Design a binder for this molecule. Structure first.
Ligand SMILES: Nc1ncnc2c1ncn2[C@@H]1O[C@H](COP(=O)(O)OP(=O)(O)O)[C@@H](O)[C@H]1O
Ligand SMILES: [Mg+2]
Length: 305
């Protein structure tokens, strides 16, 4: 199909700050449909354009189908982005509902990291040149879970190409996931490309924390705590940029590792180190996504505890 006459909208399945998301049907096939109002036009153009970059199809990037303007029956402008429908919803929602064993949690962490490494990596392939991309608002709500328990990265409304022909306020993402240099207005734009990959990597660390806070094998003989976002106990819901700057940049705080994680094991010690190397104060000392994928691959495969 790929033509918005054949498009039927069913129930709402989510919303963020730019779009409302509905389950739908495009010529008999289940799909998900992200609806932008006129005010959010630029975010639509950005997201569509990032999805249409050559070689953006990947197991760990959300599957885009078609995007275009559709005027309402009332003569208002809307933008519709049609993509594959993921019944598990966002990683945040999945983690709310589910705990997972070691292999499953590593699968979630490894698949998200693989997506981000793919996104971050420039593919200079002539007619199919893929630029390096930064997500710019990486978090649990912008990651979706497939039916196989692997993740895809979604929501490229704020993403930016970092290499290639046509380029470039940093204070634009979700506040709780902002790196300290973002909260300081200190992002070092001399090396645009590295600085912005490093900003995603910090957020990746927070994502890791949320995933493993829900791993059954990290809380042996005990209850796994109910799901909470990174920093939720410290700052609550909807922190201000100011309050976050104090906690994260000034006080250098990070989500705490439970006492239940006794690091007399290689698996746990390397888990903690990998998370800590992602959300490091020194942007330049943070793991790359490729290094992080290898860390997570190795943890997934660790034989015995
Ligand atoms: N393809 C999809 N399948 C299932 N749920 C989705 C899909 N895309 C988005 N969602 C849900 O809708 C929410 C908002 O989508 P998102 O694209 O992040 O919009 P925004 O840019 O406004 O935050 C997500 O957090 C997720 O819960
Ligand atoms: Mg979003």
């Amino acid at each position: 199909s790929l033509d918005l006459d054949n498009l039927k909208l069913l129930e709402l399945i989510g919303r963020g700050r730019y779009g409302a998301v509905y389950k739908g049907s495009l010529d008999e096939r289940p799909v998900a449909v992200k609806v932008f109002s006129f005010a959010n036009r630029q975010n639509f153009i950005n997201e569509k354009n990032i999805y249409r970059v050559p070689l953006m199809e990947h197991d760990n990037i959300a599957r885009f189908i078609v995007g275009d303007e559709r005027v309402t029956a009332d003569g208002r402008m809307e933008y519709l982005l049609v993509m594959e429908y993921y019944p598990n919803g966002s990683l945040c929602k999945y983690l709310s509902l589910h705990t997972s064993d070691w292999v499953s949690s590593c699968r979630l962490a490894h698949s998200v990291t693989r997506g981000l490494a793919y996104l971050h990596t420039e593919l200079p392939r002539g007619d199919h040149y893929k630029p390096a991309i930064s997500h710019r608002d990486l978090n649990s709500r912008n990651v979706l879970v497939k039916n196989d328990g692997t993740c895809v990265i979604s929501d490229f409304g704020l993403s930016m190409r970092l290499t290639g022909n046509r380029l470039v306020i940093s204070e634009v993402g979700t506040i709780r996931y902002m790196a300290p240099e973002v909260l300081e207005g200190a992002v070092n734009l001399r090396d645009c490309e590295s600085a912005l990959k490093q900003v995603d990597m910090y957020a990746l660390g927070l994502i890791y924390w949320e995933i493993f806070m829900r791993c059954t094998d990290l809380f042996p003989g005990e209850s796994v705590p109910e799901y909470q976002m990174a920093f939720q106990t410290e700052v609550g819901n909807h922190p201000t940029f100011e309050d976050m700057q104090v906690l994260v940049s000034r006080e250098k705080q990070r989500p705490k590792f439970p006492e239940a994680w006794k690091e007399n094991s290689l698996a746990v010690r390397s888990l903690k180190e990998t998370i800590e190397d992602c959300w490091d104060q020194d942007a330049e000392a943070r793991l790359t996504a490729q290094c992080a994928e290898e860390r997570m691959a190795e943890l997934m495969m660790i034989w015995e505890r």
